[PDB]
Nucleic acid binder design. Structure first.
Ligand SMILES: [Zn+2]
Lengths: 87, 112, 135, 246, 108, 156
RNA sequence: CGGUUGUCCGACCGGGCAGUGCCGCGAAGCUACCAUCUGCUGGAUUCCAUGCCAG
């Protein structure tokens, strides 16, 4: 096994912390950064490939996808974070 | 993309579904599930296994006649585009699905 | 350039080192003995399994006396192991067959008997020339 | 007017393309340079269509046809079948046929008037290649080889036949074809011509590996250029042919 | 050298179009559009996407740029495209009234 | 402030053909040197293919097929149920098990890739019975094939 | 699910059985270098940032 993941330990939380967000710049429009979904299942897809340099041009790749259900997200709260010499 | 008709199991198989077997003489077979795959692999006669669709074609439980079955055929010469040609074909298919469904009902009434 | 094909991603390899697979062209050979697969990786305790449409170092064990025990490169044109084709087609042949081809691309006999694999006639152009049946 | 062109690493242009009078059909690829070449020698006077037949790049051996008609096998799909019809004008008929010998570019070779077929074709199949292609069909092997498309390329001004054919065989073949024929090799002595060469009514495209004397006979036999070579150029330059092919 | 016993030649379909075009010379400044000048201006061999929709020939110019139907409710429309499929369709309802005039949909 | 007490949708935050990193806790290899399974893991670089709606009832159809249908298969999604709400659909093997929380986060690297800017255009969705080897798209086309069962005729 | 068995208890309804009789098709679960997906990020002259894992 990879050293970057051992020693193996169970997740102490069922949901799992995101641990990292994209860097913020004022110049972009306002938007959110994440969402939660529910793993419903997974199916099969055929696709018209249009990737240059690929020998499968204009042809039928068969691929497997996942279906993640996403209920409408009810917004309840807001938090603000201030910057300190201790993080 | 094309729907392939299963030779043994008689299923309307789709791309990414089923298995394909070719023999050295050059006759093509497309299979739907692994059960019919090992049926032809075990030399089983499709005119001996009762759940095969083409058995009921000869058995007379399923229709052989009338123009909707003659409508079901594979074309040979392609046709240039015309947008009206699709809708006059496409809205015919909800009629086609309707007439095939009521032909199923009256024929089974005729059987019983 | 080394004898490694360019353009074949991968299929389900089913012909390993030490496999007897019957000949297909009209060179005079009856079967070919797989001894080494060109372009295979270097992994310990792993038999290099040759896929269809891939160059394989081969030897004729049974055949005509003119070319008996003659060792020469060849490509596999047919394999019976199921493999995944790009349009969702899981498919396989009745047997495992191949044709004796030089390192450049020329081939010893004149005509290839039986069907020819789709990728074998694609990654080798003049195989498709010599193929009367390719699907 | 024969120009040298390389697809990727192999000089067999006839394997990758079907070039006729009323249309030129080339293969899809990452490098469109035979879309460039086939408009360079055909400055938008005929439809220049690139296609994929049956999911294969090898369209020159999977498709037979002439100016009157075009033939495709069962293994193509209706996306590709509609691809051929619409990219082509209304004056051309394209037919999809059922056969066991799927490589139609090897078992069927034809020109605007005649045709030749692999000798074990089913009876219902010559009658559909007759009424679509508008040509008539003979039945004759090429030096005990049954791939008539790959072993010989046909044009109405000339045809290059397989070199090891017997003198009596090529004479009767030229008798039953009515075409001035020559037995010669191309692609540095390769035995496959129709796979290696494709030629239409007013030009030919060859490989860079091909040498000048076999360019010259193709120049002379197919009546290219200014029409100065009717085959008497080959007799006048026989010493160059003898020295090169000894 | 071949020579037929009959010695006949058929008619060659050489058009007057391709007879009087201009030869291909790489040093020509006033050039054709060229797929090489197309490929290089829009990238490399793996950058520019070659455009099928610009190459077709049709009667009415805006049949272009339109996606096509392939499958409808599990029956191939492509296998079910027929010329005069209208004409078969009113032919298909010609029985339809005499089916209901005879009326085998009643329950006894 | 304007977000408070309103339902926001995946259309608002996410969009189509977007390269996406995805966060889960993996499968527990339980009931047969230590723990093997149920670990935190953020899978990066997956490609969003489509956004579904649920109320459109023709979600599993594209421009190629005019079959008004949902992404659910015959029998529903096994061990989950029949989805009736907004859904996303990502290429690959997204980590986790069914009925699990599934956190999607925007791609961290601002440098885009042509594999990300590439567009993506459906032909069909395999909605056959994943409980077994199903071979139909919908029940409307199923009874068109099978005809009438004797239990269907006795009931009718 | 369908088909197929024989042993002994004298015989037999039935039991002790073949330490769970066998053979075809198939589901679940496990899975597969026998299948599929993802695999990052730079700089300095080993170290800093960055991501992941633990907290
Ligand atoms: Zn089994």
């Amino acid at each position: 096994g990879s050293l970057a993941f051992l020693p193996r330990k169970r997740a102490a939380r069922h949901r799992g912390r995101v641990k990292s967000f994209p860097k913020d710049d004022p110049k972009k429009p306002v938007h959110l950064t994440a969402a939660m979904g529910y793993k419903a299942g997974m199916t099969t897809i055929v696709r018209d490939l249009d990737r240059p340099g690929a020998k499968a041009h204009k042809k039928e790749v068969v691929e497997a996808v996942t279906i993640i259900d996403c209920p409408p997200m009810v917004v309840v709260g807001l938090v603000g974070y201030i910057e300190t010499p201790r993080g | 993309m094309r729907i392939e008709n299963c030779f043994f199991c008689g299923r309307p198989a789709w791309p990414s579904k089923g298995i394909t077997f070719m023999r050295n003489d050059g006759k093509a077979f497309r299979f739907c599930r692994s059960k019919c795959h090992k049926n032809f692999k075990m030399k089983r006669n499709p005119r001996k296994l009762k759940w095969t669709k083409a058995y009921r074609k000869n058995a007379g439980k399923e229709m052989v006649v009338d123009s909707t079955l003659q409508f079901a055929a594979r074309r040979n010469v392609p046709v240039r585009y015309n947008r009206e040609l699709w809708q006059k074909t496409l809205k015919a298919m909800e009629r086609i699905s309707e007439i095939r469904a009521r032909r199923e009902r009256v024929f089974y009434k005729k059987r019983m | 350039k080394r004898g490694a094909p360019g353009g074949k991603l991968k299929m389900t390899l089913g012909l390993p080192v030490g496999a007897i697979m019957n000949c297909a062209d009209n060179s005079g050979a009856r079967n070919l003995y797989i001894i080494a697969v060109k372009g295979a990786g270097a992994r310990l305790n792993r038999l290099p399994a040759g896929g269809v449409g891939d160059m394989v170092m081969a030897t004729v064990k049974k055949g005509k006396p003119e070319l008996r025990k003659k060792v020469h490169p060849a490509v596999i044109v047919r394999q019976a192991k199921p493999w995944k084709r790009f349009d969702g087609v899981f498919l396989y042949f009745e047997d495992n067959a191949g044709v004796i081809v030089n390192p450049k691309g020329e081939m010893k006999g004149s005509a290839i008997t039986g069907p020819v694999g789709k990728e074998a006639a694609e990654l080798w152009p003049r195989i498709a020339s010599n193929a009367g049946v390719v699907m | 007017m024969a120009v040298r062109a390389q697809f990727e690493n192999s000089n067999e242009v006839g394997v990758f393309a079907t070039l006729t009078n009323s249309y030129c059909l080339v293969a899809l690829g990452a490098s469109e340079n035979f879309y460039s070449v086939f408009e360079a020698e055909l400055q938008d006077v005929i439809p220049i269509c690139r296609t994929t037949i049956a999911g294969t790049r090898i369209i020159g051996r999977l498709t037979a046809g002439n100016r009157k008609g075009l033939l495709v096998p069962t293994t193509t799909t209706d996306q590709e079948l509609q691809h051929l019809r619409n990219s082509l004008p209304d004056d051309i008929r394209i037919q999809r046929i059922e056969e066991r010998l799927s490589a139609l570019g090897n078992v069927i070779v034809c020109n605007d008037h005649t045709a030749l077929i692999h000798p074990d074709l089913e009876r219902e199949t010559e009658e559909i290649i007759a009424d679509v292609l508008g040509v008539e069909v003979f039945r004759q092997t090429i030096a005990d080889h049954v791939l008539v498309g790959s072993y010989m390329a046909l044009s109405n001004q000339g045809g290059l036949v397989h070199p090891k054919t017997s003198i009596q065989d090529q004479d009767e073949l030229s008798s039953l074809l009515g075409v001035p024929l020559v037995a010669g090799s191309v692609n540095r002595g390769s035995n496959v011509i129709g796979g290696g060469m494709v030629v239409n009514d007013w030009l030919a495209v060859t490989g860079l590996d091909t040498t000048a004397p076999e360019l010259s006979v193709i120049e002379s036999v197919f009546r290219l250029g200014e029409g100065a070579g009717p085959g008497a150029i080959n007799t006048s330059m026989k010493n160059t042919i003898v020295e090169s092919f000894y | 050298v071949a020579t037929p016993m009959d010695g006949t030649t058929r008619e060659t379909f050489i058009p007057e179009a391709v007879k009087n075009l201009k030869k291909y010379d790489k040093n020509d400044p006033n050039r054709r559009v060229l797929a090489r000048d197309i490929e290089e201006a829009n990238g490399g061999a793996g950058v520019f996407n070659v455009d099928l929709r610009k190459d077709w020939i049709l009667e009415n110019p805006e049949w272009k740029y339109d996606k096509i139907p392939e499958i409808f409710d599990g029956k191939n429309v492509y296998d079910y495209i027929d010329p005069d499929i209208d004409a078969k369709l009113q032919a298909l309802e010609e029985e339809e009234e005499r089916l209901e005039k005879e009326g085998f949909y009643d329950e006894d | 402030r304007s977000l408070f007490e309103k339902p926001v949708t995946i259309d608002t935050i996410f969009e189509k053909d977007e390269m996406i990193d995805v966060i889960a806790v993996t499968k527990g290899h339980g009931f047969v040197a230590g723990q093997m399974g149920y670990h935190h893991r953020t899978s990066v670089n997956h490609k969003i293919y489509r956004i579904g709606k649920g109320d459109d009832e023709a979600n599993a159809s594209t421009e190629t097929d005019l079959t008004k249908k949902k992404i659910t298969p015959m029998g529903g999604f096994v061990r989950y149920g029949e989805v009736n709400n907004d859904y996303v659909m990502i290429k690959g093997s997204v980590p986790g098990v069914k009925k699990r929380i599934m956190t999607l986060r925007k791609s961290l690297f601002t440098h885009t890739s042509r594999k990300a800017l590439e567009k993506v255009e459906l032909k069909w969705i395999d909605t056959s019975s994943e409980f077994g080897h199903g071979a139909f798209q919908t029940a409307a086309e199923k009874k068109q094939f099978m005809g009438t069962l004797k239990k269907d005729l006795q009931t009718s």
